[PDB]
Design a binder for this molecule. Sequence first.
Ligand SMILES: O=C[C@H](O)[C@@H](O)[C@H](O)[C@H](O)COP(=O)(O)O
Ligand SMILES: O=C[C@H](O)[C@@H](O)[C@H](O)[C@H](O)COP(=O)(O)O
Ligand SMILES: O=C[C@H](O)[C@@H](O)[C@H](O)[C@H](O)COP(=O)(O)O
Ligand SMILES: O=P(O)(O)OC[C@H]1O[C@H](O)[C@H](O)[C@@H](O)[C@@H]1O
Ligand SMILES: O=P(O)(O)OC[C@H]1O[C@H](O)[C@H](O)[C@@H](O)[C@@H]1O
Ligand SMILES: O=P(O)(O)OC[C@H]1O[C@H](O)[C@H](O)[C@@H](O)[C@@H]1O
Ligand SMILES: N[C@@H](CCC(=O)O)C(=O)O
Ligand SMILES: N[C@@H](CCC(=O)O)C(=O)O
Ligand SMILES: N[C@@H](CCC(=O)O)C(=O)O
Lengths: 608, 608, 594
Amino acid sequence: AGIVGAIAQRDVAEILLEGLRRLEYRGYDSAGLAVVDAEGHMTRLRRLGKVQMLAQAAEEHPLHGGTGIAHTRWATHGEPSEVNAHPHVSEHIVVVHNGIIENHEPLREELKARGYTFVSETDTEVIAHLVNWELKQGGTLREAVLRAIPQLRGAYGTVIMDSRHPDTLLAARSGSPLVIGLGMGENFIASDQLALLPVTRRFIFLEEGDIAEITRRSVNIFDKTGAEVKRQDIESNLQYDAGDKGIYRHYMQKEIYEQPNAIKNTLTGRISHGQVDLSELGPNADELLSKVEHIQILACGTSYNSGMVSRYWFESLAGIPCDVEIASEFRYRKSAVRRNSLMITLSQSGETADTLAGLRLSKELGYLGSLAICNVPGSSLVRESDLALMTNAGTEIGVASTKAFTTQLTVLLMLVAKLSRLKGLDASIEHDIVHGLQALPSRIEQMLSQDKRIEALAEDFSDKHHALFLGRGDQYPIALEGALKLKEISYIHAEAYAAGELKHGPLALIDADMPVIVVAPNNELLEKLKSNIEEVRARGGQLYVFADQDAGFVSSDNMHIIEMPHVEEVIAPIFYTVPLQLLAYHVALIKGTDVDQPRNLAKSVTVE
Amino acid sequence: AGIVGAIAQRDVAEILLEGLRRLEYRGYDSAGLAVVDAEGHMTRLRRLGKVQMLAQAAEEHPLHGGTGIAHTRWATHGEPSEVNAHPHVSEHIVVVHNGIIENHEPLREELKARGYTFVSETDTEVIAHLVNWELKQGGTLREAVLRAIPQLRGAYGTVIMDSRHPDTLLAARSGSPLVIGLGMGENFIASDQLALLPVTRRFIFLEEGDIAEITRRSVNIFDKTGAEVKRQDIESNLQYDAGDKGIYRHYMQKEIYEQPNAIKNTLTGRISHGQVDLSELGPNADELLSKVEHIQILACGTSYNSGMVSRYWFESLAGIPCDVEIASEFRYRKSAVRRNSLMITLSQSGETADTLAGLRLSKELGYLGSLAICNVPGSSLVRESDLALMTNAGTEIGVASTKAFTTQLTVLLMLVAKLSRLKGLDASIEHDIVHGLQALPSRIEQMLSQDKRIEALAEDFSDKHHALFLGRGDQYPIALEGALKLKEISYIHAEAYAAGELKHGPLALIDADMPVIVVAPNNELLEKLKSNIEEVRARGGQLYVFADQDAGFVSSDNMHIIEMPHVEEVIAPIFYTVPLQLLAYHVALIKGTDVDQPRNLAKSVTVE
Amino acid sequence: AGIVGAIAQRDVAEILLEGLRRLEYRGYDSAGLAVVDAEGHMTRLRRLGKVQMLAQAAEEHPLHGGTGIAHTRWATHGEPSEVNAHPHVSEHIVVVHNGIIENHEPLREELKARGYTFVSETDTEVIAHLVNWELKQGGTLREAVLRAIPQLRGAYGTVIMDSRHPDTLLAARSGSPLVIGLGMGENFIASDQLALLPVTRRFIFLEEGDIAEITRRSVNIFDKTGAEVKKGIYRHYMQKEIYEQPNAIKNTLTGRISHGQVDLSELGPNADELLSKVEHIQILACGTSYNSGMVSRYWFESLAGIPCDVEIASEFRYRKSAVRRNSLMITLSQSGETADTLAGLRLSKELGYLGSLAICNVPGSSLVRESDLALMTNAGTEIGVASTKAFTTQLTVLLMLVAKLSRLKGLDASIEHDIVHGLQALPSRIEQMLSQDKRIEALAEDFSDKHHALFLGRGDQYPIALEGALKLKEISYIHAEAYAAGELKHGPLALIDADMPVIVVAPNNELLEKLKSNIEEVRARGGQLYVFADQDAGFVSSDNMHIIEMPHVEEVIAPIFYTVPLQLLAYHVALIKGTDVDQPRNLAKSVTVE
Ligand SMILES: O=C[C@H](O)[C@@H](O)[C@H](O)[C@H](O)COP(=O)(O)O
Ligand SMILES: O=C[C@H](O)[C@@H](O)[C@H](O)[C@H](O)COP(=O)(O)O
Ligand SMILES: O=C[C@H](O)[C@@H](O)[C@H](O)[C@H](O)COP(=O)(O)O
Ligand SMILES: O=P(O)(O)OC[C@H]1O[C@H](O)[C@H](O)[C@@H](O)[C@@H]1O
Ligand SMILES: O=P(O)(O)OC[C@H]1O[C@H](O)[C@H](O)[C@@H](O)[C@@H]1O
Ligand SMILES: O=P(O)(O)OC[C@H]1O[C@H](O)[C@H](O)[C@@H](O)[C@@H]1O
Ligand SMILES: N[C@@H](CCC(=O)O)C(=O)O
Ligand SMILES: N[C@@H](CCC(=O)O)C(=O)O
Ligand SMILES: N[C@@H](CCC(=O)O)C(=O)O
């Protein structure tokens, strides 16, 4: 969750702990630090719980040494426990890590067979042994690291030291941020610049794929090929104490980048023993929910979009009938209620007039009861419902919704296990869901790390007046939301459509002034769409494709693949939301439109 | 000239020298430093010359130790020499000093008749020997210094250590500045915060009279008496706000509408008995200013526009020669200084690199002195100028300057009375100026109440990609400002031009896609411009005219009179800025552009 | 309850007793003094009862001496009597103490183990004996004292004296107030400034922890440790003060809105829990301050759902009232010295209120010193005899307090939100309103020749009509009277004609319908109806009904908003007439003497 590292003349323990202190706002369940004196004596401390515990544990120790690293953990692989906390060791190799090594089982078996003992359940540990192994063959720590990085698959921001030679640190970025702090005769590193503020304001941001070798007085960066690459150090002329935007230019930007932590907050207290825990609902909750044979969802705007994603989930993974409807459509028509139907409203604000009216009307129609998914406690929708689940995303200031949407999706995915009807035939469904949920936060961070590419892509839409967003199944509402976002903050006339319907009308519209975007299609779908865009090459039709890099899709001249890292299928819709959010944001930046307060839109529509 | 001090666990000499480098813009003829390891071995090193010489010596014979003081000197007592350079010593007592101990020889003979060998000419050495004396009789550094400080008359600041006890530094601010910089397990101090930036951004500014006992881990502050006062650690300074937007959508909108209030505040304390009262400048002041024969103003952007207005005023109302220049252009050219030239800088932020460079350069060029007109307290332009007039507009958050500009104008109009040349004309002049200033807040309110008209008018510009703004005389720089504003927040290519130069080029451009705006022309000028727009009737040229309702101008089909309320002449340029601000604001609103943060622009351009 | 020390060349008994006389408002059961002359020679006099009785006993055997300490006692640790009253003796070292020595239990019998006969049931005596003990040998008075306050826990203020050496007084501030008075060859030390007034107006307040030594010639304020320690562009102040209202409200708001909520955390960590006990609010004030409270009543009852009464301070102080259960006593006062208001506060102390809150604009004023809690309006000083910014900053504080006394359960949140929204709107709204000043100034011409006016308002605008009428009386000398709008027809309608314009403050459509009808009734006598209304109401003017349109405001801050044109109206009528605006005839900034 959080990384800090120091290489100085002076003792750095207090500096490390203070860094962690400043990273605490990011969800963690444990912390640790390791420092090495000049004689190469390495002292390591790890504790379950808050950074405060770690600091106390440190109170007893003369923690001397000028080199060290430190970490706060958000467990994905192995229960939160002192045993599982970072830094993780392999004798003299010491390692802190953000992210997920997903080829961790292959690597753990291979390293076990080579004579290593895994004392922990983490995925992180294979890094420590691996580097160790790679150093066993010889070379410098840098060379060993270069040999090791390529064997890893997934997300890693990692910092690595050799206690036998404390004058150097190695760091590698791939799917998780790292930034270097330059001092006077000392140097630093962190996953989050806020941690370095107490000791420097001069930073070098590591970019995707970078690998750095840091000493007290040198920084050398380079790519996986050992080829020295250069990055600019820049004074941070930022006012960190100015207001609530923190380091960000826009509320909506901050709310996009805050998504991993908002999600951790949504998850807090709702995973117990590898299972979804919704006990917060009351002792007799399972009592009402067991009776449910049908779900009705009402919402407006982006909330309607999340509902729309959830429909696919409920029906495929929980096998309960689910209906989702624009709230104003529901309030004004005479409907036919399904038997044993649960009424769910989704709303960021809890105050949207159509949605509220929908609920109120439902009061007199024979629903088993109502559940409110909301982001503002004490709002009408929460008060007036039987049950309520808060998204806990923190306040959202941007008029366009971002973290509210993804946290909503998180709650809706947790409902799936607790509302199952496939018998079954289950067990593994809930395990899969919980696994994905556990990975979600760092998966989102993985997406954020692709931002430079999305920024670049934005140039392709900056001057367009139309766009068409395509999706199929659980990705169709993602296209809905991507298209909405582009309408919202860039004022481009972007429209979403079910992928399968492209040829039934919109194909007639396509030309150079109307780019087509597909979100996460499988090979079969892709080939269909590729043929479609062929039909319109002559008018300059461009197909942009957000897809799994594992799929091996290849770009043509009018079909452009924008590869994304692999993810758990069950959370793939939340994952693919991020690049469409980032696209819209970067287009708006280029055009210079009012991102936080788009023309004619309101945060919530509360008057009739 | 410069003082620097560090008390840390790491070696502080490198930090001290770097501090001195960053203090090179002041002083100086010699320099030196003194450090101390844990055993008490004090190493001192001093050179006549540049800091680079001292750093050179320091390099091939390194100073080791975590406690230390350094200094750059501009000699006042004693010829520049290694002998007289700081730090000065009294055995174990070591001292650095800025300013003057006025009663030096009395105390020097007093101590000389006590066994003290004065090896230097400086007034500084007395400080050392006295501290030595007071410590002779028990206690420790603090008590002693607390006794000694009252026995020194003069405006000065000093940092004092005892090498028998390296764990503490003592400081005294008594007429010359000192600020403490808070580190991590280490602490610093200097004569200006510019010196501590490499190492910290947490500052505690000492109040006049304060005495500080500083350790690695602690900082205790007292006053002349020795009664522990507490001081707070600022950093910034430019906080927002929320919230403070009040009834308005945007920071910039709010800042536009608060201009009457901001102007009232700019006037506060500066009007009495129907006259301009700038007594806040100092008892002297009225006498440095009397010697001025020429005004030079330097600024960037909107501040440059305000300077540009003020030239007209100074020359016609006060009869003083006045030149105004883009700061970039001033700093990069060899200029000819006028006899008895006052340097004025205009700056909202006080940090703009070009303008600061201009001021510093002015110091080597033989200007009578400098005045900063600024909106942000304690900023660089203010600290480095001889005189300062704060605009008191409150913090301004929008990237485009609005209230900062009109308050600048207010202060500049105030300077006219206080700098007249040109006496006898004369009281009629200061009279009209004060009458206008008193009318100003209400005139602005009148103008703000035309907003609906301006908002309707903006529909004529919201689809345009070109505009030409015209003005004559004290209104030409208002056209400059109106054009800049339309550039800034609506991204329309608006260009200002002197009204009499239209025929010399731009007239060939005018057509339906390039509306022409004139700012407050009299009847003769308007006849000329109407005739001009008639020349391009066949291309659909339109003239827009913001003019006095009293003037009786009649709209036609290609000329649209946008009548305004009447104003006192002397404030007309300030008055006519408001509509142009509102116009740019409302065009931006329609287009939906980012008003508060326009693309590519910055609040303040501080780096190179 | 109260202290009065003294050292001089003259007999100080009369002094000490007058110093007490003035600290009688503090509530006490016993009293006494101890003086000492040139050679010997101490004399002590203590009585149960009123300080008056004491003085009468003093009359019979006139106490002589240039040094002396005196006390008025509220018994809080040892029965009310003569034996327990101050000063307390110990062979020569005499002591007068305000407060409680909390560790008097383990120190008194700890010191009885040394032959120290405790002759009273007070904690105060463990002060007298301790010091006596540390004067076996140990410098002199100040030296022994700088070794006693360290081991004497609690919130107190003691004044100590020696008898062998009559030239010195010691004084310790470690819980309750002491202020020193200078000093023409003689010095003084009271528990309150008020006690020193008949003799000296020069004061040196002790800070928390200081040990002071006083003689004829010097006043050293040591420490526990502890060594030596020692109109602008405006024609009138009232005009300036009206136009400074936006800045003044900004200052009132500073630090008090945190994370979208009202933050009165300045009241103390406890406070908040103390306010949770309040069940009824009682407000006491005079003049314009009364008008502000009058507005807040509507707010507290409708928005916080808590009961509130508001009363002319003079009325409250002279009647036997029925206190409500769990009642908070709030006073409103610009100056902090209004005698009626102060009297009401002091009376409330003995009537069983949960406690007192002072809303005030002058720091260190009596109302502030004598109240449990305080909220300063921070308006800056107000010079004009007629209050302007003091009024609207008062309204801003009372409004802030609404959310903090909320009793409406799950409604509370939303309401607080509205209040915050409105508070945050307030500065720019007032700025909107001040730009109507040219309109008001023109309007004033209608009133400058009048000798009568009627101000009407309903609900939370009713008190604003009161304030508006008051302003017109104050600085224009026009007989303006306010009436609840619904009462117009019950008498005053008979008065209406051309020479008595009627002013309505911010009516809704329904009320305006009623009043328009009413003024139709008096058309034959030229009844004229002036209406300050929201432009969004779309009211239309006629020959006898003049709509004076204003910008829309947030409902919750409307009374503050509508106050401003009334101020400007009064101001400009006065300007036309050329009356003494900053100093209207027969009126006073503050009415501080009976
Ligand atoms: O084309 C318009 C129809 O008249 C349509 O409006 C519908 O018939 C009514 O709105 C009733 O619908 P509900 O019975 O569902 O309210
Ligand atoms: O066309 C370019 C010129 O070479 C010009 O650059 C000039 O010669 C120098 O810039 C000198 O400038 P100053 O002497 O004014 O500094
Ligand atoms: O007409 C006057 C009455 O005499 C009046 O003074 C009242 O009857 C009591 O004297 C006072 O009332 P309180 O008991 O409240 O003081
Ligand atoms: O989620 P709700 O509070 O019910 O609001 C529904 C929609 O309202 C507005 O249009 C907001 O701009 C949207 O971002 C939001 O999705
Ligand atoms: O006035 P200064 O703080 O010196 O800045 C000069 C200019 O700098 C930037 O460009 C700001 O965007 C401008 O609005 C400002 O006028
Ligand atoms: O508010 P206070 O300081 O308690 O004074 C109450 C009243 O006293 C005097 O009459 C003043 O002229 C008034 O303007 C004030 O309202
Ligand atoms: N997957 C690693 C790292 C988690 C993190 O990024 O905090 C673990 O479970 O320990
Ligand atoms: N007057 C001292 C100090 C000069 C300075 O402030 O630089 C000297 O000449 O040494
Ligand atoms: N507890 C002390 C306090 C003295 C007082 O405050 O009057 C007593 O009862 O005497």
